[PDB]
């Protein structure tokens, strides 16, 4: 859209300032190769967690590291119906978290969705296309949730007409 343009430009510019990932083997365990932002084992391989917010309640928290990036998104939820629909939709997104290679089966507490892009995802898959996917999600999620809301309204109207027709 055109009301999220500076917010999305800032988010995209912060995404490709992180996502400069490198291969790294663990220090606190013999031969494991684990994402350093998930284990939080070494405090020297962790960059500052940067927040980019459009208003009080829509934001992106980006936690960088040497071989991983965790991007948590707190989406706009205006009323209770949008909250229910956003919850169910994010849940149906988590369900397939092996088809989405950069997704995370559980969101970071306080945030609606979370992506975890390690270094293998930037070595075996296009980096700019991952950035584009994140920005496209942030662009289109509000529109899709609004269409869900309109679908619920239409279902309510059809149910009312199906009842009051028999009288």
């Amino acid at each position: 859209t055109a009301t999220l343009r500076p917010y999305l430009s800032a988010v995209r510019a912060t995404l490709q300032a992180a996502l400069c990932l490198e291969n790294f083997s663990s220090q606190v365990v013999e031969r494991h190769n684990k994402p350093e932002v998930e284990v939080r084992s070494s405090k020297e391989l962790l960059l500052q967690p940067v927040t980019i917010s459009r208003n009080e309640k829509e934001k992106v928290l980006i936690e960088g590291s040497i071989n991983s990036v965790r991007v948590s998104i707190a989406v706009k939820q205006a009323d209770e119906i949008e909250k229910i629909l956003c919850h169910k939709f994010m849940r149906f997104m988590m369900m397939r978290a092996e088809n989405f290679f950069i997704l995370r089966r559980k969101p970071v507490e306080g945030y609606d969705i979370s992506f975890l892009i390690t270094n293998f995802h930037t070595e075996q898959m296009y980096k700019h296309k991952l950035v584009d996917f994140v920005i496209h999600f942030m662009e289109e999620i509000d529109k899709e949730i609004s269409e869900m809301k309109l679908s619920v309204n239409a279902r309510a109207r059809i149910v009312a007409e199906e009842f009051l027709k028999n009288f």
Binding site: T1, A2, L4, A78, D79, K143, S146, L150, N153, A154
Partner: protein, 372 residues
């Protein structure tokens, strides 16, 4: 900067934009199309429904339906989709960041504007909204404070006299007779030549023909005799398949229905008599000021030479000492929106919105108390 949205949302053409401009940002036909066949090619654009210009482009394989009929919303599941496409696809702006200014024809069911408010607040969560009459916005766009507007909208015609900014709600007149009825009439009378248009995709072609070749006659009988006696008044149009049609006498019979509803089997009176009666409904001591400030509007008053016919009819009706001056700006097709971009931009208006908390307190019925 942050400014209110102005959404005309007419009966046939949805026009939306930002307040403070001199032209609508997005203009598109308010139709919803759904496919009537079954795809066979894998992965090629399988989606539920097209809306707006996209439906016009792919109208060959869709069935088009108008959500608004005669100025009344008759399918809310489609009006919601229209507004959604306006917000997120045409203007591409979040709905809960700007106040909205909607328009509605006068003498309309209260349920219409009540549901408008309910949709704008519960669904899209706009922080403020307002539902103004179309003729008042047209007069605001004209740039005066007294006169009678004759908004021959495409879906509906209506006249609203105003004097010194004091609208007279007992002289407003509404006539359900406008562009869509003329389109259907043209479809009905085109069969005489032999051209048969039945489906909606063909009604769109008929509207494109009406919007291009039709014109109103200064004197009906004279034009009929001229078209019958000489083949010098016929025009040629090319359908979007290569066929060529030639329409003559029909050209001025379609818009003539506006002045003679008897053609369409209606008991009503022409728009000229409607305007004259709406003027004579007012008190005498102001009638002259109306006679010299008759204003046209709507996309159905774009027919060539309609100002002359209207002036002649009203001069024949009104007394012979009043100066009739049909104010017809060459931009009338957007006047209803233009005045909006003015009204929402004024500084003495920012206290007349319907705030979200006012609605949360008083229910959707607050539109009757706030909006005139």
């Amino acid at each position: 900067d942050i400014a209110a949205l102005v959404v005309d949302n007419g009966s046939g053409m949805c026009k939306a934009g930002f307040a403070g401009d001199d032209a609508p940002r997005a203009v598109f036909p308010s139709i919803v199309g759904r496919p009537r066949h079954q795809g066979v090619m894998v992965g090629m654009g399988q989606k539920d429904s097209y809306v707006g210009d996209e439906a016009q482009s792919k109208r060959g394989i869709l069935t088009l339906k108008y959500p608004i009929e005669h100025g009344i919303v008759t399918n809310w599941d489609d009006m919601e989709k229209i507004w959604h496409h306006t917000f997120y696809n045409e203007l591409r702006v979040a709905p809960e960041e700007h106040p909205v200014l909607l328009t509605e024809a006068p003498l309309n069911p209260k349920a219409n504007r009540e549901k408008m408010t309910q949709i704008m607040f519960e669904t899209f969560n706009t922080p403020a909204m307002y539902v103004a009459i179309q003729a008042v916005l047209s007069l605001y766009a004209s740039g005066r404070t007294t006169g009678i507007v004759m908004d021959s909208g495409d879906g509906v015609t209506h006249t609203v006299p105003i004097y010194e900014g004091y609208a007279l709600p007992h002289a407003i007149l509404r006539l359900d007779l406008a562009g869509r009825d003329l389109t259907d009439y043209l479809m009905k009378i085109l069969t005489e030549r032999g051209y048969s248009f039945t489906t909606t995709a063909e009604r769109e072609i008929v509207r494109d023909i009406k919007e291009k070749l039709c014109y109103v006659a200064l004197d009906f009988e004279q034009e009929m005799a001229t078209a019958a006696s000489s083949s010098s008044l016929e025009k040629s149009y090319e359908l979007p398949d290569g066929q060529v049609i030639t329409i003559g006498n029909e050209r001025f019979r379609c818009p003539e229905a506006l002045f003679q509803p008897s053609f369409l089997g209606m008991e009503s009176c022409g728009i000229h008599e409607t305007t004259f009666n709406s003027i004579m409904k007012c008190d005498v001591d102001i009638r002259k000021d109306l006679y010299a400030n008759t204003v046209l509007s709507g996309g159905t008053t774009m027919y060539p030479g309609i100002a002359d016919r209207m002036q002649k009819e009203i001069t024949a009706l009104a007394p012979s000492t009043m100066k009739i001056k049909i104010i017809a700006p060459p931009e009338r097709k957007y006047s209803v929106w233009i005045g909006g971009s003015i009204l929402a931009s004024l500084s003495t208006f920012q206290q007349m919105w319907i705030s979200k908390q006012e609605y949360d307190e008083s229910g959707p019925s607050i539109v009757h108390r706030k909006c005139f």
